[PDB]
Amino acid sequence: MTAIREIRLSEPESAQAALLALECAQRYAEPDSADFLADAAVLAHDLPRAVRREVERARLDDRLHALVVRGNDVDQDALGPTPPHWRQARTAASRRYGFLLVLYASLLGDVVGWATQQDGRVVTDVLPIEGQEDSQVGSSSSVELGWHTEDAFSPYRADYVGLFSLRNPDSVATTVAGLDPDLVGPAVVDVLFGERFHIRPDNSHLPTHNSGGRLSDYFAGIVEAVENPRAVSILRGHRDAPQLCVDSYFTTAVDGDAEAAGALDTLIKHLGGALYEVVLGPGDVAFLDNRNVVHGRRPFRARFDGTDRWLKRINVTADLRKSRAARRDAQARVLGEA
Amino acid sequence: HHSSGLVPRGSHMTAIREIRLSEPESAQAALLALECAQRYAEPDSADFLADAAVLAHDLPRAVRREVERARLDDRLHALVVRGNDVDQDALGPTPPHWRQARTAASRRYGFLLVLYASLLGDVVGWATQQDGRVVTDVLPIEGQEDSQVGSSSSVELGWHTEDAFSPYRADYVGLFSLRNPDSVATTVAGLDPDLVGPAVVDVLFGERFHIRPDNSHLPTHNSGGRLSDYFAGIVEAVENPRAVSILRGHRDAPQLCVDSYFTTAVDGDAEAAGALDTLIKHLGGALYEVVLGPGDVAFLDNRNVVHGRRPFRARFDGTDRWLKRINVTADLRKSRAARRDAQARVLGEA
Ligand SMILES: NC(=[NH2+])NCCC[C@@H](N)C(=O)O
């Protein structure tokens, strides 16, 4: 019943969070500057105490779907037009929301990015792009973004996905679903626990969703995982509280495993119907527990006039150390630079 | 006066991260611990542990900044915070057994250890160790002088990664010194890859070793039927050990997992047996010491270092060395299969 933990900020709590984000913007260049990220875990504890208490309850809730912090200050006039592409979305006016997303995120763990997503940016942008209407990436609009575990293919996938809504004039819903092990039966659960599935990287990790100047070798890891997926489970951990890892568009049973293929089909139908809506208004930030829920986004008509929906996105890990083989050096936060 | 610095050991330039508390920092930390002891039942009660990660951020800001640098330093051996307040008169005598060591007078030091530890991660304990207490006690016990346990004295505690056999082994081992009149040391060693043949290093990265559960996990006449399922898992890990690596992760910053008394090569892998004994001689030769005076707290990065303890002469007169001890995980969620419920912190309790 607390699977969605909703914190509505008081005026003072919103004001204090804004002032802390603005102090960070005054000190540091980028919301993912190395010097800022080294300090971020400590700066995050200058957020309001009552908010930190509720975030800490969310962090240790192993059945959390989403923490939702409502009512951060967003100055729509100062923010200016929604950029027409993520590459142009590192705007002066939006920096403060980047810094604030990292401060909230750093209460839950350490922020990471992907060498193969939005040019290795840690703070990324979710906005509609002309020509991506019908794609299965974050910049889509007309076609529903299919539910998925974020970076489901990767052993380094985030523990939390952070989404800070700057603008959402048409109240477009984020979609969310967890797995009730009781409502699929221990038969299917036992199959979903088996290493009997292939989970391929999604299209956001491909050269078609990154700058052309990026090195071909960044993508070798991704292409290997498309061509030759490892046999993996969808469920793991305790039977009473199993972790979920599946992507509606990029998951298959291994060849000739009709029982695995059947279990996958049951899961898709179970998650598809159970899929429920969370609307992030301007100033609302959600942390999805990526171990527990799949997420997507409802279809919407983008106006492409500078007024469109705009989220900042971040990946959070409970354990930065575990991915050191995949990072350039100790402090580097970009997965797949090694 | 507050100070902090990097103390090298061999070529490990940030081996030891030392923080010296100012008198005001020491007082702030003591007042926070005392306030926690007024508001919460125990240093490891559910009420306190649900809040511990937020309460830890009431510790002095300058100290939190230095602990945070330690937390993300993937070459750290030991974080040492020196100069916490200990009232020796009020503490009273060193108990004769851990079973008598969860004292009202020492609770405030349990609280403070959990507060420092919760800056680094989430505190955990072990079903088979001191009845699954999260805050444990390190003191010499009469009759254990010559054993390979924390309560030993006369015989060196031989060095190991803490709970080396276990995928749920801690990221940090924390120690809060209450008294140490004879300046008895914890022994510490990490691998310097530049002092070992690259071929030996390559072998240690292979899944070519068995790391068996140590004595603190093995069933005895008195280990109890309650942990029947744990001891079955332990028997499996003794009789049919998984093939595991000793080194893992990035070549530039490998994690170490080895136990000087419970590690062997896979049957017939003579090259692995050679690489293992080369590593044991290297770590044995690189061992150095951390001595914690009263109010000194250390966090050993269990991913990077083995640890043990020097031989010492216990008096068993109530004046002996006494530490509070804790285990810290960077990722509590990963061990849910081995814990009784979401908030429970005891590994092997279900
Ligand atoms: N649609 C789907 N089933 N999976 C891929 C979604 C890509 C999205 N996380 C992104 O843009 O990062």
Residue numbers in the entry:
A (entry chain A): 1 to 338
B (entry chain B): -11 to 338
Paper text:
CmnC is an α-ketoglutarate (α-KG)-dependent non-heme iron oxygenase involved in the formation of the l-capreomycidine (l-Cap) moiety in capreomycin (CMN) biosynthesis. CmnC and its homologues, VioC in viomycin (VIO) biosynthesis and OrfP in streptothricin (STT) biosynthesis, catalyze hydroxylation of l-Arg to form β-hydroxy l-Arg (CmnC and VioC) or β,γ-dihydroxy l-Arg (OrfP). The overall structure of CmnC shares similar folds with canonical non-heme iron oxygenases. The catalytic iron is bound by the 2-His-1-Glu facial triad comprised of His148, Glu150, and His295.
To assess whether we could control the substrate stereoselectivity of CmnC, we performed site-directed mutagenesis and created a CmnCL136Q,S138G,D249Y triple mutant, of which the three residues around the substrate binding pocket were mutated as the same with that on OrfP. The activity assay revealed that the triple mutant CmnCL136Q,S138G,D249Y almost abolished the hydroxylation activity with ∼3% relative activity to l-Arg; however, it showed ∼6% relative activity to d-Arg. The mass spectrometry analysis suggested that the compound 2 is hydroxylated d-Arg, of which the mass units increased by 16 a.m.u. compared to that of d-Arg. To illustrate the molecular detail of the engineered CmnC that switched the substrate stereoselectivity, we solved the crystal structures of CmnCL136Q,S138G,D249Y in complex with α-KG (CmnCtriple,α-kg) and d-Arg (CmnCtriple,d−Arg) at resolutions of 1.67 Å and 1.75 Å, respectively. The crystal structure of CmnCtriple,d−Arg revealed that the substrate d-Arg loses partial interactions and adopts a different orientation in the binding site compared to the substrate l-Arg in the wild-type CmnC. In contrast, the side chains of Gln136 and Tyr249 in the triple mutant CmnCL136Q,S138G,D249Y make close contact through π–electron interactions. In addition, the water molecule bound by Ser138 in the wild-type CmnC is lost in the triple mutant. Nevertheless, the relative activity of CmnCL136Q,S138G,D249Y for d-Arg hydroxylation is not as high as the wild-type CmnC for l-Arg hydroxylation, implicating that there are more residues participate in the substrate stereoselectivity. The structure-based enzyme engineering changes the substrate stereoselectivity of CmnC that accepts d-Arg for hydroxylation.
